[PDB]
Design a protein around this ligand. Structure first.
Ligand SMILES: [Mg+2]
Ligand SMILES: [Mg+2]
Ligand SMILES: [Mg+2]
Ligand SMILES: [Mg+2]
Ligand SMILES: [Mg+2]
Ligand SMILES: [Mg+2]
Ligand SMILES: [Mg+2]
Ligand SMILES: [Mg+2]
Ligand SMILES: [Mg+2]
Ligand SMILES: [Mg+2]
Ligand SMILES: [Mg+2]
Ligand SMILES: [Mg+2]
Ligand SMILES: [Mg+2]
Ligand SMILES: [Mg+2]
Ligand SMILES: [Mg+2]
Ligand SMILES: [Mg+2]
Ligand SMILES: [Mg+2]
Ligand SMILES: [Mg+2]
Ligand SMILES: [Mg+2]
Ligand SMILES: [Mg+2]
Ligand SMILES: [Mg+2]
Ligand SMILES: [Mg+2]
Lengths: 54, 88, 51, 100, 271
RNA sequence: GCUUGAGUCUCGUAGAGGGGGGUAGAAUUCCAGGUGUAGCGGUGAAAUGCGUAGAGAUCUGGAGGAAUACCGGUGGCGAAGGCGGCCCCCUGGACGAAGACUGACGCUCAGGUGCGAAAGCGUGGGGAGCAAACAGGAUUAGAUACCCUGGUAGUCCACGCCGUAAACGAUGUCGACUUGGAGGUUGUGCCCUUGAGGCGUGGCUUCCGGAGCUAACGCGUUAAGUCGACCGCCUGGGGAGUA
RNA sequence: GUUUAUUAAAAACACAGCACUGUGCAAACACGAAAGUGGACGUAUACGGUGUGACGCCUGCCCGGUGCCGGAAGGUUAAU
């Protein structure tokens, strides 16, 4: 569901600078936000998403 | 915690019949098994006070029940403390 | 961070940098000594926001 | 039983040596009681950031089910192999397929 | 294990002993012993050189293997025993072909574990292989200055050397002194750090403890007469001069490295 | 004797709960090299300080220490202190569904035992930034201060000691009863189930407020309201938490 | 514990401990015109020199002088 390989959708919760979008803006739930951020960090470590566009 | 298989084994060993989980004897057996299992975990590390707190919780309960039993059936009590090897 | 403006840019007017946070992160980070401060910077204005 | 999900990367140059790694690791996993539910490789693909100025590392994903001992020796195999770069081990995941 | 002696009598109050219950009580392996022939600090002319040496215990000698040239023949450690010729303990190793030798003892050697030497070998501590096939950033026991010569560096208790760079035909090493040195990549070195790291924690205590280790008293120069030391002289504890060695060379400074042949490999000096 | 207090068993859930090990990105500092040249830096304004023995700025390579930028919240966990990168091993507690089992096994607790921020002490390591003491430059009538330039202990690690904080919700623990409204977080049941929906039932948590209480401020189902069990503490200010 | 054999046994020397400093191994250093030897069949948890002298609490300010360490600027400067 929230696996770290699902790049083709996990782009929407990342800004142009690699920033994570808060739930206040996204509209997502709290538990889902937590697991989504954790999966984003995991994919970022495994080199699927960039830490920064720099 | 303890494994389901070990818990069922101890329950069937110490309780009278099936589903006899509330008996003081099975309570004592489960607490003793957990304490013995955690002995090695606390031999290693020995810096985990948060878990040692739960260990002390277990120890206090066993003692409280062992007393209830000794106040009911000294017989049962003695046999139990002999089986599990305690109450020095 | 980067500007990719269309071929007509006039005198190179910065329209996308201005819409972006510009100095959002810059101003957020240029401050110092974030140890004893945050415990007391907390909402309570949100509370005053009421009819 | 506690299943594991192994993901690892390889040097882009050693593209032809990945199948040997996969077929050798699958033997070690399945030796005692292992059983792979999801084996796949993405192969070459551009990286997000340059790991020591490298690109197009091979991504290999596996869903194994084996005890801590075999998986520990398998994990240190990565730490000591120079052809691999990164590694990750994740929980059960309930054996989902594809998800690419 | 470090143990503090109780203050029964003057001489035991400040004695700190190191206890190693996993050493061998019996006698050493006789076929690997030799004569030691204490010298007392005298050279072939009979003149005292390197003062403050004399006396001690009989101190037989053990033949320790430093070359470590046994390729493809695994060995198992039988036991650890005390060696009086060095600060580190030694391990007796038996090979599968029926030969016994002495080696230095890494930290986690214990007993009854396989040891592989030379050529390809596991990266586990204890094995020996050339640095051409050792990962960068790993601790090793005793490094050979030249290939096939024998480990010389970091051979003392609890000492180790870590590799910093391998690019080229040489390898950069950070020695315990805190200096960078280049060594040929073909030189061998065993993995880990030699054990007995509790060595400093001893305190000896009484003067006899140092006496029966072969160390004689040291007399301060200021306590002498001007005829036998640049210091000394004057009535009432006067010094009034720059410290020097008994032969007139300045101490507390005045670097004395005068080798122009080995400066090639000294990447950075001690700090 | 009994099962409603207390407890055990089965299936699940959330969480920076705790201990050990590993690894990743950004940035500061430092070292080597390349281009380059008169300033850099700092203040209210300056100076000290660094630089023509080539600084600052900029690019390449390398070393090492420390903390994990948003996510992040009228969020969560923990008895308290307190706990935020990611991954693995060991491990404690809490909550929900019914079902079964024991049968008062309970509450509180002087003495006693354990845990306990920061600073501090002992031994051995490590030491990039920050920074008591200390040095210099400023301001001032004076400035051993606020400001500026450096900078040691310390801050970090392992094992021991210290046992103190506005250690605060300035509110001891346990149990029962007493109108509501608006939120957050985490479970669960029924249904035209069309939906990011209707109707219920638990745990924790934020705000506003009724009766009541209170010297007042205010508290108000998480009481400072009505009661019960036990413990701790107070008797004008200073002297003094001192001899 | 040691000391002025034969007028001085001590508060003098040594001492365990502490600190600074040199030393990467053909180590520093010492004896030796040299070969060579000790250091050491040791390898920075090692060795040499210097000061202080168990242990407890501590060890403040000054780099102007002398010494030592570092410094592709500049001035002066031998042999050739
Ligand atoms: Mg001495
Ligand atoms: Mg005299
Ligand atoms: Mg003289
Ligand atoms: Mg005098
Ligand atoms: Mg004088
Ligand atoms: Mg339980
Ligand atoms: Mg008390
Ligand atoms: Mg502290
Ligand atoms: Mg300390
Ligand atoms: Mg320290
Ligand atoms: Mg300052
Ligand atoms: Mg108090
Ligand atoms: Mg607090
Ligand atoms: Mg508070
Ligand atoms: Mg109070
Ligand atoms: Mg109110
Ligand atoms: Mg007092
Ligand atoms: Mg005497
Ligand atoms: Mg005499
Ligand atoms: Mg010689
Ligand atoms: Mg003296
Ligand atoms: Mg004195």
């Amino acid at each position: 569901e929230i696996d770290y390989k699902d790049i083709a959708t996990l782009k929407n919760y990342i800004t142009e600078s690699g920033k994570i979008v808060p739930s206040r803006i996204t509209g997502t739930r709290a538990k889902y936000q937590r697991q989504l951020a954790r999966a984003i960090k995991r994919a970022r470590y495994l080199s699927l998403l960039p830490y920064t566009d720099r | 915690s303890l494994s389901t298989e070990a818990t069922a084994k101890i329950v069937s060993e110490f309780g009278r019949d099936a589903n006899d989980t509330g008996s003081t004897e099975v309570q004592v057996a489960l607490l003793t098994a957990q304490i013995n299992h955690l002995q090695g975990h606390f031999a290693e590390h020995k810096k985990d006070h948060h878990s040692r707190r739960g260990l002390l919780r277990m120890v206090s309960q066993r003692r409280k029940l062992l007393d209830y039993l000794k106040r009911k059936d000294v017989a049962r009590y003695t046999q139990l403390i002999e089986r599990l090897g305690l109450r020095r | 961070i980067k500007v990719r403006e269309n071929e007509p840019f006039d005198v190179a007017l910065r329209r996308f940098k201005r819409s972006c946070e510009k100095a959002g992160v810059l101003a957020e980070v240029r401050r110092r000594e974030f140890y004893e401060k945050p415990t007391t910077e907390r909402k309570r204005a949100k509370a005053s926001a009421v009819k | 039983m506690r299943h594991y999900e192994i993901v690892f990367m390889v040097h882009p140059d050693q593209s032809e040596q990945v199948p040997g790694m996969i077929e050798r690791y699958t033997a070690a996993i399945t030796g005692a009681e292992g059983k792979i539910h999801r084996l796949e490789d993405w192969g070459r693909r551009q990286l997000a950031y340059p790991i020591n100025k490298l690109h197009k590392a091979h991504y290999v994903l596996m869903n194994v089910e084996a005890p801590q001992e075999v998986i520990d020796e398998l994990e240190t195999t990565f730490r000591f192999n120079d052809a691999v770069i990164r590694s990750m081990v994740m929980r059960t995941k309930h054996a989902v397929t594809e998800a690419s | 294990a470090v143990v503090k002696c109780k203050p029964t009598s003057p001489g035991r109050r400040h004695v700190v002993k190191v206890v190693n219950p996993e050493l061998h009580k019996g006698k050493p392996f006789a076929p690997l012993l030799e004569k030691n022939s204490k010298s007392g600090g005298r050279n072939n002319n009979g003149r005292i050189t390197t003062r403050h040496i004399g006396g001690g215990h009989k101190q037989a000698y053990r033949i320790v293997d430093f070359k470590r040239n046994k390729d493809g023949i695994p060995a198992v450690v039988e036991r650890l025993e005390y060696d009086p010729n060095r600060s580190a303990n030694i391990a007796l190793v038996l090979y599968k072909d029926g030969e016994r030798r002495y080696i230095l003892a890494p930290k986690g050697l214990k007993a009854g574990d396989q040891i592989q030497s030379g050529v390809d070998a596991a990266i586990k501590p204890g094995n020996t292989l050339p640095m051409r096939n050792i990962p960068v950033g790993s601790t090793v026991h005793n490094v050979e200055m030249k290939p096939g010569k024998g480990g010389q560096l970091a051979r003392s208790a609890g000492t180790y050397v870590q590799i910093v760079a391998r690019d080229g035909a040489y390898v950069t090493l950070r020695l315990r002194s805190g200096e960078m040195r280049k060594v040929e990549a073909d030189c061998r070195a065993t993995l880990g750090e030699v054990g007995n790291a509790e060595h400093m924690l001893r305190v000896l205590g009484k003067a006899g403890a140092a006496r029966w280790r072969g160390v004689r008293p040291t007399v301060r120069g200021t306590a002498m007469n001007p005829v036998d030391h640049p210091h000394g002289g004057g009535e009432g504890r006067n010094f009034g001069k720059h410290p020097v060695t008994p032969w007139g060379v300045q101490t507390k400074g005045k670097k004395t490295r005068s080798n122009k042949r080995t400066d090639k490999f000294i990447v950075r000096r001690r700090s």
